[PDB]
Design a protein around this ligand. Structure first.
Ligand SMILES: [K+]
Ligand SMILES: [K+]
Ligand SMILES: [K+]
Ligand SMILES: [K+]
Ligand SMILES: [K+]
Ligand SMILES: [K+]
Ligand SMILES: [Mg+2]
Ligand SMILES: [Mg+2]
Ligand SMILES: [Mg+2]
Ligand SMILES: [Mg+2]
Ligand SMILES: [Mg+2]
Ligand SMILES: [Mg+2]
Ligand SMILES: [Mg+2]
Ligand SMILES: [Mg+2]
Ligand SMILES: [Mg+2]
Ligand SMILES: [Mg+2]
Ligand SMILES: [Mg+2]
Ligand SMILES: [Mg+2]
Ligand SMILES: [Mg+2]
Ligand SMILES: [Mg+2]
Ligand SMILES: [Mg+2]
Ligand SMILES: [Mg+2]
Ligand SMILES: [Mg+2]
Ligand SMILES: [Mg+2]
Ligand SMILES: [Mg+2]
Lengths: 118, 206, 146, 65
RNA sequence: GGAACGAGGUAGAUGAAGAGGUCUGGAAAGGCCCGCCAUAGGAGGUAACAGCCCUGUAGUCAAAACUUCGUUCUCUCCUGA
RNA sequence: GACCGAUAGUGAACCAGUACCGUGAGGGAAAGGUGAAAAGCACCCCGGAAGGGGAGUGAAAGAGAUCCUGAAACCGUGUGCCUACAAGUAGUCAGAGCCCGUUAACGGGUGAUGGCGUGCCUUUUGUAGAAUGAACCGGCGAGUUACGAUCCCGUGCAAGGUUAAGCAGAAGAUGCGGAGCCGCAGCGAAAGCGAGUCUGAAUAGGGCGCAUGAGUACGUGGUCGUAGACCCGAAACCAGGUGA
RNA sequence: UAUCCUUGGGAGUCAGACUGCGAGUGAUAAGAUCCGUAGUCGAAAGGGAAACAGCCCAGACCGCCAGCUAAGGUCCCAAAG
RNA sequence: AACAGUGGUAGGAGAGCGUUCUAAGGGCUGUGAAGCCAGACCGGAAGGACUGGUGGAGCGCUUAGAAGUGAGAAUGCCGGU
């Protein structure tokens, strides 16, 4: 029996074009360039899901350093102080304190400072 | 195994012993599967063909010179990448039939008959004699025997009166003892065999 | 079995491999033939036993022997086969052929002396091995050549 | 169509009981002055086809019993 | 070369049984509830998918004329141990 | 009919060997569908007409003659968000603001700004490559079939296994058909001998075998042989014709 | 520590590249050429060397707005003296 | 359950998705089938549903079988733009 091309080809390509909504010009309209961009977007999305975890850690460290230097400590020494005091609060939470509850952050910073002066 | 021996009316006239060598064996499912595929393949007509690039009309000359035109090089307007061109491969007339070993054939039919007995779908009649060809008569007989879905009727010899009475009823097939076969028996839910026909079938298989 | 509940015996059937149907199949693109060269071409490859121009093995070696027109082949029967028969039977080639002990007569039946025979038989055959003749006679039988 | 036996090979090989191929030795035609008697004694005997070569040419002798 | 007869081919004939009730619907052949014919439940068509609406089908018949085959008869021919 | 269903199937579903092309031999297309029924839009309005807007017919006119369905490229109209200091393989991750409200989901649309980031394919030691291929969209377009060989797997029987043609039968199953084929015994070039046999002067040694045994029929799958043999592509060769 | 061998089925490969080390050819030139030896690439994404197949660190089944380290770094671009 | 592993070209092996047709069961459909057009749903992937719009008569599902069975590239062929 003969198998006509049928509707399978159009269905598959439409799915890709729907994933390409919002792409510029032909990249949301033409299957080949759309297909390339959707494939390329896949590699980028994977890469960036791993880069996300570095960018936010980078952001937290920057914020902690600013708040630390408001207590007369560099980030290096603050983190060393916390480790000596056994504090396991991570940089996401330290950054949160620095921004949302600065008094709490200073308490942790003072704890670190005690250990450093020991 | 023992089964009830009926008459056309539908009353039980006691029982009858079927030969265990034919109706009592453990159905070999694997050989039944093969028997069914083999038979259905043997029914295939296999009359299908396409035209390859040699058979398609025209296409002799080279569409254009090999070099210089800037077109892809082509050899014939009936190449398989051309619209209208020859098909690459595709259906060609062939037969699908093949043969199983005789013993596998016998094992298949024995398995299928013994399976009928396991499901209580084997109706044995003292005899089946119709006075005249009359579909009404046959339909009444089948209702008497509580035959609802398809049924295969197996007579010992050519029974013209029965064949004509049952010909027109959907899903009711009439067969001589010689003509019984795996696909027919498996297809039809009930097996109405006559006592005379049972011995003829046993004679061959046993 | 039901026509709507058919199952093949496990491992009796496999699905054919279809090459050149995309990357994910693993036989996409080059369809298992690697890259270029004679072996990858359609109807490619050299003839059986060709060695690239190195002299083929068969041509390096010398022909041997001849075929005898009058070559006789005997349907051989060992003593263990005769043991299947009953005592007092005269085992002729006609009896052997009918009972299916031998499939084909060829130039005749030859009895050979492999195995044991514990039955008195009147073996009639075209040829006997020295061992077979002794063994048939040793068990009280007769080994008549015919 | 039936596969055709390689007739040149049929004249050169012979199947053994276990399906190996028996062959003659090369260097057994002439120039025997240039070969030591030890070589000649040994080349006179038959040999078996190697595993490497057997797989290359097994199909050429398929029809041979 | 000629008759008689038989079976065919080249047109045709006849041919059973539900507008069943009801529900949607432009339109029932469909759904639901009931029947009936069948040697006929092949098929096509009919306002949606029909064994019971039409042409049909199974079955049984039909040829002025032409044509094919067959069997008998006529006719023709014929000694061999 | 486990054949095609309008790029398919005949080149030709249609006024097709036609149109067209060629001096000629010759080559050689494209092109199906209103509706159940023309009931094929009376009449009115704009217009020279075409084409429209009503009104009627119809179940439907968003079925009105290239008249079933009507995808994508492509061309437009309206606007919710953004856009005139910006360096862009155009996305992706982060992210306010504004606008919406879903297959109700740690929702949808847009995206100021930040980080990262040189298409796809082929061919290559190595290609973002300034090496090759693709204007775009759609359809079509490439390991198949027959017959043999071999291996794995499955099944039947098993020192046995199996029929071919053919004859009966639904173009079937099946029944009959044992001719033939493979295996159970091998060794030798052969005569021949035979669990041995060949070499040899040899009860010697050694080779190949046996003792240390499973084959066969059918089916599926892998590969191979012969066939165009995975598909496309030469420059040429030959044969018969057509042209001064 | 968990490979190795025999038999059989199916392959692909025969253009290699650079880096370190031991040599030849060359001029103790070449991103040159030809071998030995180890690695990486080829067929390997991630981090570093500004960019940079072959160098340094290290092997991506997948998610996380968690942590510790490698090479390399910590004045600003740009995480950290 | 524990432990271990899970980059990959040529290539080998396994398990699947989907398309057309057939058989057998069981269904859907004029109270609207296929196709087409949306959507924020589902599955590990190929993919599968549900709802609404269009459409106006055919089509799924389960098991098995058979293949003209899957396209983005061939200066591919044809059509449209
Ligand atoms: K190459
Ligand atoms: K169409
Ligand atoms: K295209
Ligand atoms: K002339
Ligand atoms: K390579
Ligand atoms: K609707
Ligand atoms: Mg296609
Ligand atoms: Mg031709
Ligand atoms: Mg691969
Ligand atoms: Mg290539
Ligand atoms: Mg040479
Ligand atoms: Mg009538
Ligand atoms: Mg009638
Ligand atoms: Mg309709
Ligand atoms: Mg056509
Ligand atoms: Mg219609
Ligand atoms: Mg190069
Ligand atoms: Mg090139
Ligand atoms: Mg180009
Ligand atoms: Mg170099
Ligand atoms: Mg690369
Ligand atoms: Mg890993
Ligand atoms: Mg640290
Ligand atoms: Mg900094
Ligand atoms: Mg195809």
């Amino acid at each position: 029996p003969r198998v006509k091309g049928g509707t399978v080809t159009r269905k598959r390509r439409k799915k890709v074009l729907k994933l390409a909504k919002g792409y510029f010009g032909s990249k949301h309209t033409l299957y080949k360039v759309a297909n390339q961009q959707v494939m390329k977007s896949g590699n980028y999305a994977f890469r960036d899901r791993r880069q996300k975890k570095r960018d936010f850690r980078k952001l937290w460290i920057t914020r902690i350093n600013a708040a630390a230097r408001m207590n007369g400590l560099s980030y290096s020494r603050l983190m060393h102080g916390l480790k000596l005091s056994g504090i396991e609060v991570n940089r996401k939470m330290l950054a949160d304190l620095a921004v949302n509850d600065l008094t709490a952050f200073n308490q942790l910073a003072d704890a670190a400072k005690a250990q450093l002066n020991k | 195994p023992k089964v009830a021996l009926y008459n056309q009316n539908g009353s039980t006239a006691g029982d009858i012993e079927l030969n265990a060598s034919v109706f009592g064996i453990e159905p070999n499912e694997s050989v039944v599967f093969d028997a069914i595929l083999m038979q259905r393949a043997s029914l295939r007509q296999g009359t299908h063909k396409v035209k390859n690039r040699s058979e398609v009309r025209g296409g002799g000359r080279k569409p254009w010179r090999q070099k210089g035109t800037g077109r892809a090089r082509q050899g014939s307007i009936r190449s398989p990448q051309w619209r209208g061109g020859g098909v690459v491969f595709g259906p060609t007339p062939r037969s699908y039939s093949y043969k199983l070993p005789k013993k596998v054939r016998r094992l298949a039919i024995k398995s299928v008959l013994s399976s009928k007995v396991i499901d209580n779908n084997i109706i044995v009649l003292e005899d089946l004699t119709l006075d005249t060809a009359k579909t009404k008569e046959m339909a009444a007989i089948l209702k008497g025997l509580s035959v609802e879905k398809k049924a295969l009727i197996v007579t010992a010899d050519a029974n013209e009166a029965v064949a004509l009475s049952a010909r027109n009823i959907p899903g009711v097939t009439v067969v001589e003892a010689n003509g019984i076969n795996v696909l027919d028996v498996v297809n039809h839910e009930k097996l109405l065999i006559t006592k005379a026909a049972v011995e003829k079938v046993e004679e061959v298989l046993a | 079995m039901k026509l709507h509940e058919l199952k093949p015996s496990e491992g009796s059937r496999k699905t054919r491999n279809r090459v050149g149907r995309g990357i994910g199949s693993g036989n996409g693109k080059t369809a298992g033939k690697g890259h270029k060269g004679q072996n990858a071409r359609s109807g490619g490859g050299v003839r059986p036993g060709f060695e690239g121009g190195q002299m083929p093995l068969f041509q390096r070696l010398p022909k041997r022997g001849f075929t005898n027109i009058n070559r006789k082949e005997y349907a051989v029967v060992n003593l263990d086969k005769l043991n299947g028969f009953a005592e007092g039977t005269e085992v002729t080639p006609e009896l052997l052929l009918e009972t299916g002990v031998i499939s084909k007569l060829n130039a005749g039946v030859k009895i050979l002396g492999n195995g044991k025979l514990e039955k008195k038989l009147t073996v009639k055959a075209n040829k006997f091995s020295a061992s077979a003749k002794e063994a048939v006679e040793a068990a009280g039988g007769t080994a008549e050549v015919i | 169509p039936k596969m055709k036996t390689h007739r040149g090979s049929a004249k050169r090989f012979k199947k053994t009981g276990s399906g190996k191929l028996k062959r003659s030795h090369a260097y057994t035609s002439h120039l025997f002055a240039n070969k030591s008697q030890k070589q000649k004694r040994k080349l006179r005997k038959s040999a078996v086809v190697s595993a490497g070569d057997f797989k290359r040419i097994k199909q050429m002798l398929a029809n041979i019993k």
